[PDB]
Amino acid sequence: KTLEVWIMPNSPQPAEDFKALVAPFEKAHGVEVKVTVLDWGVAWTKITTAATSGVGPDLTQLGTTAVGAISAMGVLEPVDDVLEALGGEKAYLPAVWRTTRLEGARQATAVPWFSELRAFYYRTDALKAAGVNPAEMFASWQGFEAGLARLKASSFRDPETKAPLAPLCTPGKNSWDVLHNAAPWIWGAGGEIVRQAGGRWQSALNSPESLEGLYFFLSLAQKGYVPAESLEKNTAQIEADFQAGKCAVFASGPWMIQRAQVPEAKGGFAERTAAKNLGVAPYPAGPKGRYTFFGGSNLALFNFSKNKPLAKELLKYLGGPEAQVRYAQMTGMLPALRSAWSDPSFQQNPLLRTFIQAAQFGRTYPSLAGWGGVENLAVQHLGMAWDLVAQGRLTREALKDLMDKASAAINQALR
Numbered sequence: 001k002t003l004e005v006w007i008m009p010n011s012p013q014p015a016e017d018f019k020a021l022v023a024p025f026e027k028a029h030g031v032e033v034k035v036t037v038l039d040w041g042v043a044w045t046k047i048t049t050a051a052t053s054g055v056g057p058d059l060t061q062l063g064t065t066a067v068g069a070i071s072a073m074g075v076l077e078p079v080d081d082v083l084e085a086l087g088g089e090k091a092y093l094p095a096v097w098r099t100t101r102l103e104g105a106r107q108a109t110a111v112p113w114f115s116e117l118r119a120f121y122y123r124t125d126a127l128k129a130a131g132v133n134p135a136e137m138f139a140s141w142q143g144f145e146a147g148l149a150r151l152k153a154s155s156f157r158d159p160e161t162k163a164p165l166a167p168l169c170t171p172g173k174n175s176w177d178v179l180h181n182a183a184p185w186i187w188g189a190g191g192e193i194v195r196q197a198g199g200r201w202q203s204a205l206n207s208p209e210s211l212e213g214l215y216f217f218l219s220l221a222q223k224g225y226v227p228a229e230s231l232e233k234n235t236a237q238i239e240a241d242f243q244a245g246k247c248a249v250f251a252s253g254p255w256m257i258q259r260a261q262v263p264e265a266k267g268g269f270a271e272r273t274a275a276k277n278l279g280v281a282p283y284p285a286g287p288k289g290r291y292t293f294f295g296g297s298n299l300a301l302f303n304f305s306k307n308k309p310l311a312k313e314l315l316k317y318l319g320g321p322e323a324q325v326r327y328a329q330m331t332g333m334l335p336a337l338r339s340a341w342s343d344p345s346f347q348q349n350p351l352l353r354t355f356i357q358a359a360q361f362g363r364t365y366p367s368l369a370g371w372g373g374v375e376n377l378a379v380q381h382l383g384m385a386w387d388l389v390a391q392g393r394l395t396r397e398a399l400k401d402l403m404d405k406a407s408a409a410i411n412q413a414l415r
């Protein structure tokens with residue numbers, strides 16, 4: 001008669017939004033869904049305890065990069081049946097399909113719920129003033145850097161700040177998404193964070209391709225295109241700087257589009273020049289291709305659940321077309337179910353349609369049991385690289401030294 005579901009704070013009123021989302025399910029099945037909101041401050045420790053103790057909810061949200069770790073503990077129920085009901089492998093972007101299982105596992109243990117992806121917002125007024133065309137600027141890395149150089153040389157001033165814009169704003173090391181900000185550049189160069197050989201995983205952060213991508217990105221902040229102050233800040237703070245009219249180009253997710261429609265008084269930026277002059281482009285095509293970072297969250301069923309049939313019916317509901325569109329809107333994310341990308345909620349909005357175009361270039365990390373150690377050691381060393389950038393002292397040699405140190409530590413952790 002009750003299901004217990006743990007979620008993270010994905011929407012502006014996390015428990016109210018989720019309860020509204022599931023109310024039709026509760027009526028149809030005659031059950032009550034009891035939702036607990038795990039603040040991002042405590043979510044991972046609460047989930048880990050549940051997994052280690054065998055005490056916890058029926059379903060939990062999992063970030064896509066946590067699926068391998070929790071699956072490897074052997075505490076998750078298989079959900080092949082739910083995914084086949086939703087259309088199988090072909091119903092999902094392959095990057096999203098990768099997140100349904102521990103890498104190499106025969107069975108699915110997570111149901112895709114919603115996708116985070118990143119694309120560049122830009123100031124359509126600033127690019128027009130600079131004589132930069134977005135089609136050309138985001139067609140290649142060379143065009144990207146050439147567009148920032150035009151934006152740096154431009155005399156354009158924001159009509160409210162009365163100041164020139166930073167060509168590019170990005171966090172450096174002081175953000176939750178350090179690796180995710182770097183990943184499209186690693187991938188575009190032809191690199192990857194880890195590689196498999198003999199079924200054993202090792203770091204590839206020190207490969208020649210990975211180093212080219214990392215240097216291309218980090219060095220933009222050494223060339224005058226990113227303000228030093230940006231490197232102190234997290235993504236949320238850089239989003240505020242863009243809203244305030246201080247940045248011509250910056251990467252974020254689809255939630256900024258809804259923020260642009262909402263008054264400043266209610267936490268949005270509708271009144272600001274940036275909201276009235278807003279563009280989106282995908283990450284620019286690199287040497288070996290165009291990639292869009294995918295993250296977001298899935299749902300999993302603990303094998304100590306007393307209510308596995310009803311929990312699987314809720315997975316099918318949350319994973320399915322109607323709830324996919326409703327919850328994508330609530331969270332400012334993209335549906336995990338790829339069919340939902342053609343819904344008018346995305347297609348009627350030009351900026352959301354650009355996110356849909358970016359989405360087909362999606363790529364994610366391998367679903368490793370040891371992923372958190374990989375990311376943590378990657379980000380420590382990328383941090384030290386960002387510290388050299390802030391001093392104008394990041395050389396190609398210094399970057400290679402730091403990624404060799406990271407690779408040695410990663411390979412030890414993976415063994």
Ligand SMILES: O=S([O-])[O-]
Pocket residue numbers: 133134135136
């Ligand atoms: O380059 S503009 O025409 O998209």
Ligand SMILES: O=S([O-])[O-]
Pocket residue numbers: 219
């Ligand atoms: O590419 S060098 O100018 O950092």
Ligand SMILES: [Cl-]
Pocket residue numbers: 094095098362363364365
């Ligand atoms: Cl992928």
Ligand SMILES: [Cl-]
Pocket residue numbers: 192193194364365366
């Ligand atoms: Cl990778």
